[PDB]
Structures are given as C-alpha cells and as structure tokens.
C-alpha cells in the first residue's frame, strides 16, 4: 500500500478534503485528557496557539465548558492575529459533543464557522 | 526475428512436449561440457533428439545436464493459397543466443562421458562448440 494506508484509523485525507481551501484547518486535535487546536492554512502555513487546555492551565471544568471557552478564546486570540472566517478541521472524531464544543468555540468566538 | 502470437492467444503456454533436463552424474570439481555460438530458433525435436542421442550412447555419470528448451513457435500453409495468411502452427524452438552455456558433461574423471557429449555434439545442428569449464576437465 502506502504508509498511512497499511496503517488506518486516519482520513487525514478528508483533512486534504478541506486542504483544497476555505482558509484554515482550524484543527481541533483531541486526546480526551485535553484538547489542543492549531491552524494549518494552506501555503505550508503554520499556526498560533489559539487554543489549548494548558496555555491557560487545565482548569477543572472538564469537557463541556472547557471546550466552550478554549474555543471562543482561540477564535479571539486569532482574530487578534487577523483572520476572519476559518474552516473546521474535525481533527478526528465524529464531531463528538466534545468537538461540538471546541466548534461553538470558534462559533461564538466570532471566528466565522 | 519474428515470433509467436500471444502466449495464451496464438499458441501460448505448453509443455513443448520433449525429453526433460538431467541424466548423467554429480561431482564437485571437473566441468566437462557443451556450448554453442550460432544464432537460431533451435529445432525442438532436432534438439530433443540430438540430446537424448547422447544419452543413448552413454547411460550414467557425467552430468548430461542439458541447458536448452524450445518455448515459442513457427507457422505456414492451411486455407486458400498464398495472399491472406490465417495460420498453421509448427516448430517449437528456442533462441540459441549466439553462444552460451548449452549442455554439460560434469564430473571428476569420466572421459567416457566427455567423448559421449562429443557424440551428442557432432549430433546437434548448428556446428556448436566443444569445451571445458572452471578449472578445465581433469
């Protein structure tokens, strides 16, 4: 096959799905413990720590809120940066109520999503 | 160097009906042997014969290993005259690639065999070269 293909679980490709364009893989990356999200925007882009459950201490609000806010937040540190409308990257999972969470994160953030 | 149709389509994948590869015997040293240097769709039958010929003149030790095999085929006459050629098949042969490792007479000391191949030699069809391998023959 190909590396990722003999392996599995992944679909980094639907990642590509978005890669086409629409601005940035506002990518939610999750490992229950926490979540951390970055921004891969086309052109061998980069990022800007917009959201992580450790850039501001792993509270104790667990999922629900945790994601709510860290999201809103990322959205904002970001607009500070100067973006506008970003594009949703389901790092993985079926936009799990968790992702859902990060998601409204950008949502309310204002982060157009 | 024209050749066969499609080895599953004209005439492709046989058993070239012949007379196998090893008769003769063992040993670690003396390479006693036969190779040639002509170029040709080595004559199935012909060959087969020649070869078993040698066998005939001998019977045992002295590697009568024989490194040849007819695997493609000739064609001609079957239908209306001379213009449009459908295709009758005959002649299974192999490209004797202008010299190469033909058939061996391998063993420590059994000139009986050597001569024998010789025989097989005179036999064969395109002149062929009579010879020795990596050390000589004994």
């Amino acid at each position: 096959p190909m590396r990722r293909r003999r392996e599995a679980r992944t679909d980094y490709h639907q990642r590509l799905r978005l890669l086409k364009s629409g601005k940035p893989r506002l990518v939610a990356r999750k490992s229950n413990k926490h979540v951390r999200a970055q921004l891969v925007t086309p052109n061998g882009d980069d990022t800007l720590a917009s959201a992580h459950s450790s850039d501001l201490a792993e509270y104790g609000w667990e999922p629900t809120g945790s994601a709510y806010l860290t999201g809103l937040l990322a959205g904002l540190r970001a607009q500070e940066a100067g973006v506008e409308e970003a594009v949703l990257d389901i790092g993985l999972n079926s936009p799990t109520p968790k992702v859902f969470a990060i998601q409204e994160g950008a949502i309310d953030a204002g982060l157009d999503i | 160097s024209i050749k066969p149709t499609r080895r599953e389509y004209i005439s492709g994948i046989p058993g070239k009906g012949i007379a196998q590869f090893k008769m003769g015997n063992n040993t670690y040293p003396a390479q006693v042997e036969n190779v040639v240097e002509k170029p040709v769709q080595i004559r199935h039958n012909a060959l087969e014969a020649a070869r078993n010929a040698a066998n005939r003149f001998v019977q045992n030790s002295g590697k009568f290993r024989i490194r040849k095999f007819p695997f493609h085929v000739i064609r001609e006459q079957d239908g209306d005259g001379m213009r449009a050629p459908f295709g009758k098949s005959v002649g299974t042969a192999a490209r004797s690639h202008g010299a190469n490792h033909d058939f061996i007479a391998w063993v420590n000391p059994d000139p009986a065999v050597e001569f024998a191949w010789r025989r097989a030699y005179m036999k064969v069809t395109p002149t062929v070269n009579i010879d020795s391998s990596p050390a000589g023959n004994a």
């Binding site: 590509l16 890669l19 086409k20 086309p42 052109n43 | 459908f86």
Partner: protein, 86 residues
C-alpha cells in the same frame, strides 16, 4: 446474413492522449495534463504518483485538467515566481 469465426483478423483504432503543455511552459488555464478525460483539474501543478517524486511546471493561472490517476491531481500549488506584483 452474418459474420464468421476462427479468423481473428480484427484491426483496432485511433486515440491521442498526451502530456500537452509538458512541465514548465507558458501556463494558461487550459487542458493541463492528459491520459484520463472526464478529468477534474486542479491547482497549478502535480507530483504525487505511483513512482514517487513530483512535478513543477513553472506556469500558473486559475487551474488545469488532470488524468484520473495517471499523472497527478495537482494541488500542491506553485503559481511560480512570475506571479508577483506585475
């Protein structure tokens, strides 16, 4: 009123695929590269493939057209240097 057998006798016919434009030539939102028609073009150039490496054709405008799995559904952009402020 019919056809026969045991007479393969059957020519075939034409086609005309290609590497039309070839890599690194005056780019022009046009039939990019071809070996597979109902193509779905892509961005600037391509270089993924069943061999490894990658292709850069120093020419870009909107986009080009591909070859179903041959060549390479471009996407790894390269608008090329000659694409800076006039």
């Amino acid at each position: 009123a019919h056809k026969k057998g045991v007479g393969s006798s059957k020519n075939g016919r034409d086609s005309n695929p290609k590497y039309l434009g070839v890599k690194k030539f005056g780019g022009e939102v046009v039939k990019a590269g071809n070996i597979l028609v109902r193509q779905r073009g892509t961005k600037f150039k391509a270089g993924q493939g069943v061999g490894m490496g990658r292709d850069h054709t120093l020419f870009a405008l909107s986009d080009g057209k591909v070859v179903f799995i041959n060549k390479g559904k471009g996407a790894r952009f390269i608008s090329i240097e000659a694409a800076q402020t006039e």
